[PDB]
Design a protein around this ligand. Sequence first.
Ligand SMILES: Nc1nc2c(ncn2[C@@H]2O[C@H](COP(=O)(O)OP(=O)(O)OP(=O)(O)O)[C@@H](O)[C@H]2O)c(=O)[nH]1
Ligand SMILES: [Mg+2]
Lengths: 143, 142, 13, 585, 165, 415, 141
Amino acid sequence: EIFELKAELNSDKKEKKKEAVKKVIASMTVGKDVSALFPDVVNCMQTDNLELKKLVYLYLMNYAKSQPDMAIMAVNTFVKDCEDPNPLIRALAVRTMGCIRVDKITEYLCEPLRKCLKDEDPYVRKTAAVCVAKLHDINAQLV
Amino acid sequence: MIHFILLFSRQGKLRLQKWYITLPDKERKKITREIVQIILSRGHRTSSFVDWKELKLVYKRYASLYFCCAIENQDNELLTLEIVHRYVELLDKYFGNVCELDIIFNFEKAYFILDEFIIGGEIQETSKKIAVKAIEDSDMLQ
Amino acid sequence: TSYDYCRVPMEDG
Amino acid sequence: PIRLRELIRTIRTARTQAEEREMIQKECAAIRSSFREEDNTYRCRNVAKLLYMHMLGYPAHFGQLECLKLIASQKFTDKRIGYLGAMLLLDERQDVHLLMTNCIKNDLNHSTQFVQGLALCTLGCMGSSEMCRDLAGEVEKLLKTSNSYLRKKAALCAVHVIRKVPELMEMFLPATKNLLNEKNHGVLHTSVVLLTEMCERSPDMLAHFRKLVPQLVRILKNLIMSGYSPEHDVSGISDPFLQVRILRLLRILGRNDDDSSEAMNDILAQVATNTETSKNVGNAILYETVLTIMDIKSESGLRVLAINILGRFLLNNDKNIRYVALTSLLKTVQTDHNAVQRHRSTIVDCLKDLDVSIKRRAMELSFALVNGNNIRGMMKELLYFLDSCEPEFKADCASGIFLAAEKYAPSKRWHIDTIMRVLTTAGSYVRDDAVPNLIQLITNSVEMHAYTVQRLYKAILGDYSQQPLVQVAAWCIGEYGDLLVSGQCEEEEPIQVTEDEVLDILESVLISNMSTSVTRGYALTAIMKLSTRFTCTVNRIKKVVSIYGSSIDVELQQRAVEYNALFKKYDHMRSALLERMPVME
Amino acid sequence: EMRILMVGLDAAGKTTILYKLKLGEIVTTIPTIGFNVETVEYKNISFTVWDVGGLDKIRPLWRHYFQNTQGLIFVVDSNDRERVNEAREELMRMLAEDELRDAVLLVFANKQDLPNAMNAAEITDKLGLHSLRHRNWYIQATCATSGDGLYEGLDWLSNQLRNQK
Amino acid sequence: SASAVYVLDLKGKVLICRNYRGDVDMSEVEHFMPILMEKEEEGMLSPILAHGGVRFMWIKHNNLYLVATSKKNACVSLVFSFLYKVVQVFSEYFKELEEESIRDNFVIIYELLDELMDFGYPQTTDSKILQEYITQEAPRPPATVTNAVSWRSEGIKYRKNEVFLDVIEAVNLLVSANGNVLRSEIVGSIKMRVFLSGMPELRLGLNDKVLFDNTGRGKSKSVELEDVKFHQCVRLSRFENDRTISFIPPDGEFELMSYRLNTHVKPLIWIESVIEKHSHSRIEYMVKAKSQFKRRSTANNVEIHIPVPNDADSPKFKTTVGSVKWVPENSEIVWSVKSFPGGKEYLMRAHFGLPSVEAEDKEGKPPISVKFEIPYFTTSGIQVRYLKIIEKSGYQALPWVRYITQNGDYQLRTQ
Amino acid sequence: SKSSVIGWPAVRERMRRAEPAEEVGFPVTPQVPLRPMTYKAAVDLSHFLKEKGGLEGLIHSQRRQDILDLWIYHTQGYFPDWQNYTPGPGVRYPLTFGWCYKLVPVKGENTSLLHPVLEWRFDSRLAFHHVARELHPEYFK
Ligand SMILES: Nc1nc2c(ncn2[C@@H]2O[C@H](COP(=O)(O)OP(=O)(O)OP(=O)(O)O)[C@@H](O)[C@H]2O)c(=O)[nH]1
Ligand SMILES: [Mg+2]
């Protein structure tokens, strides 16, 4: 049931892992405790589809508090995606960064935040400006 | 003395009122709204009775539909639940696999079944056979 | 839109 | 015109209630317009669709005349619709229901028993007090019949007219004579409920009716010994509905008699042993059996057995039975009083139960369990239980604390101490009605007001927002101010009474918005008394009276100006009427 | 279509040799806190690669990939003798599982430009690879800055994946 | 300042949930609807509720409760203006916005919630530019998203160049039971439908009173705008100086400006109605409808809604021109006239019955609202003078306009 | 399979409200050409059922089939005998050459008060390797 979903989530084909993560946030849409499947959708996160990465960012922000220790499995993936030349995918990470509230994470993400503070495109810089206040919401003195 | 009888849905949708006490419609719409709210805000191990404002208010869930009575505070309680269940039996008798949607539809005879069972707030036929017999004969009278 | 339009000037110098 | 279920199916498709009202007033107009057509065809269904809207809660005042037409119809189904909504749309205060009186009276003389069954149905359910006066001879006439289909109905209809008209039962004393041998149980049941009613209203009827006590002792013993019938039997228990009503009739009979109480003693000893306590039914049999035994001057071996019945019922995990058992000892508080007191810890256990009604019955029975022996220990549970009440029980407990404390207080000081404890911890939960009672008992108290008013002063500096707390305090400061500030006309060594913060704390109430203005009603009353109860600093309090003469509360604008002229013109006549109030009961 | 891991203690150059196999470059990479995943198409078998770093807070979190797990690569750190012992207790913690049973062992001798590095025989004898029952192991010398020894270990791994011509 | 914006239904279950700060718990939503059941049934309904320290800013759609929750002293109009914008953008995406629109299209809607607002701060709410990188069918964000001009993307190209204007009048009216006009203002609104090539700067001029007063033509026909609220794209600093309506429009349909003014001239149509409410018996409405407006003009498809009693029954209508439908579902009559010219005066005589029993409760007095529409007719007399098309490429567009006068709130308080 | 999208949740609801456990005659749509469910269109349909979803692993029944088949005939113009499967003994293989789904065996208030079956499986070789022909050789010649 969820394991068949985790079977499609640990699939190698894109069309199976893409429909799997849609069912997860549809299970989250209908309000199911899908927090138990947390680090398994994290495996199908670093994907070439930008349309799909928003669903995981939706999940990780929602279940950051629920799985605070398991949330250490995204820090490398954020600093990976703060550097991709699409400004859409960089600011998408940045707003995912600051809204995820785990104090085990916020110390690591200040440097790609500092990187995106001095970015080029106005799009991510107006996004990175708010993430500072998101960080100051989480840890004021670290800012 | 049964003061009134209420049958309201899982959504609280009242499928029957029968006021054996004469209180006006605003008071009917007030009191009915409160007790539906009371019973739906009440758990499954809460003794099937409410001491509601000098009425030992009897509730007994059987399906999605909920059930309600207001007995006088000198009378029996489990039998009052059995009164519901005997009436449940008579609804189970006259219908058979007694079920929710013709409570919504054929309620008119469910009043008539109550009329063959409880008039004045009390029982007139303590048999379960003779009462549904009489309503079939009046149905055979049509 | 069953009603019809009317053309205004451009400049009105 | 569409059918009922076609309408309901359309109503079941309604999503928004406002949208549903659109569907209501859609069909309701056609129902109205059909009524303007004076239709007899669809008048069956248009009323039936209307009563659904009435059950849906919609103004269906208009079709009530058509119901009178349906009662005054000739087709049986139109009557079958017509008698129904008469019980629905009409009540006694409907005031248009009086036109049924002729129609029912003709239809009490209808050939069909089912039409007469409809007439006895509608009058039995909602017959008005004057309609009961206008149909009384016909009901007993249909109680003099032999039709057990009608005898079961005219009996309960006779209850209704005796219920509605209490001065009417004397024409039913001859009606009820010797029909107690009915082979049918249902007619025999309604006769018992009638004899339950007849014995209920008049004590003068008891003499005629306690005679036939051993008649039904036999017939109830027939119900125990006829252990099965294909009808009346639920779970192997034969006609339990009749059996309880006999016991209830046997409960109200013999309750101050002994010979009938001994005429019923045998079957009481029987069914206390000869019941099946497995199902819910035999518990319901045995519950009334307990209550029948407690209320009559019974055999002592019944009552000792009956507490042992209840000791079982205290320990059944069915919360029904726990509600049953707590109600049972709540009934027989005074009767067999100390066999209840040995079940005390079971009652303190049910204070920690997770049901409202169980905690309700336990708290109130604990209010009933207080004698002058458990007064010290149980209150400490109860004052703890007052802390562990729900806010619905906090109002209920704090009053019921005050009730039993006024009964059985071993001390007057400790009586004060617990009340002062409750007034600190109830606050917004203790009722304002007990405040003149608490004020009365502390002036029924005569000896500890220096003990009282200091402790009154020591908590009101904590807060004022507990309004029934500060209702109590301001009268005590006005009356027993001399015991608060004592010999301190001028400044002395600093004791906790200081006769200025004493005056400031009442002044703090007068400006604070969290004042019920009878707080401020008591406060100016206390100000004006401390013009006499204090000799220390008066005429600074005259300033407070004088500035309050422009106040916005009407009486508190009266109260200040009516005080102030004594403060300005009749300063010697201020103390000429400030003698302490007398003490009453 | 066969998957493979990159686990081991950190500061070992495993994300360096990841993108040396992925891109062909010496990449500038932070000490990897979360994880890394790309895939490599080589010898018509998609070497899909899962890197997890070696920080202490991410040591218990290796199990969440161990459902549906077919391969293994342990990256030693032989330039650190003071940390090859705790990486060895890390290895016997990981190899003491009943869930990781089909996974053949594949040791990469990494950072092979310092003269303090040992051979493919001493690191084998220090770690005890011979005492590993139901473990098809083969140590492989991989220099990160050059890129040599990488594809030959991917050859033997491709002989561990399929058993055909 | 939002923390968690939610969407409920008529039952109170969460259609979609989205937090922005985490400062409001996600399960706080389940107290809202009972508090909504509380405040309404005691009549203490407000668009802000409060369960302790969580503040419940909500609007109500057809089914939907766009509940935006916060805890601090948040900026209130910041919330609700965004709330109607989210309704608007969903209306821009989903042609109807219901439970089917949400549960079937959660792919895009969560992405909208990510995009429209961060942390409680709305940053990108122009749906037309939002279509270019948020599709339900991803590239980089456009420069117009970065640009201060945030309503119009460059490179928009059409074959023709059409500027379709809709100067729309909306007559408010409050006539009391006395027959005097209490409040008759006119809120007119020019809504533009632009189909143009490239990036044009359109400069508009009207028969403004102040602009004619600055010109020196304050003796001719000049409408007096008491207040206008414009689009963003209007450079209001340029307008503040010298009444200059200069702007770069977005592409497509949009309301540019929203003028409002009072008018001390007669209503276009005067209604005289009577009520012969006979107790327990009947009621009669001898209602006439005279047209005070211009005889060349014709009030199209007027719909006179006269509130009748609820238990009113047996309708009779002696009209003159125009049909009545009795709407008991709204407890009213719609004496509908399709073509009703100026100067015309049509009577209708209604007749119901009434039940001989009274009802239980009162009903109150709703006013009469009609649904007139007069084309080619500015009652305020507003006139577009020109429309300067300014393109760097340079073209001759086709500016077009039509005039339509409708009701605003055309309430006339009954007897 | 364009107009089969607008009833893809609508008719399936009527299928799911149909229990898996007046009118007379048969109208024919005027001037619309009719044809059986052809091979490539069944390949177009089996992928239409593979992509649009909501069908796989659903409780198959005959009442759901007849709701579905007549809706194909009235909205798409295809003879409603194409959803025929092999009978009881064996896996319910489709007789249709091109149907890649075989059938393996597996409201709420209509219940009373007190109380006194197949599913799909995608098999893309059913279009070529007719397994129902292996279950029924003598009928297919
Ligand atoms: N001199 C030399 N240094 C190397 C060589 N390989 C790796 N290193 C060093 O080892 C460090 C660790 O390499 P990384 O790949 O960036 O980090 P990592 O080993 O993957 O550790 P994690 O990121 O935590 O997984 C690098 O910064 C290099 O400087 C090598 O072949 N020669
Ligand atoms: Mg690394």
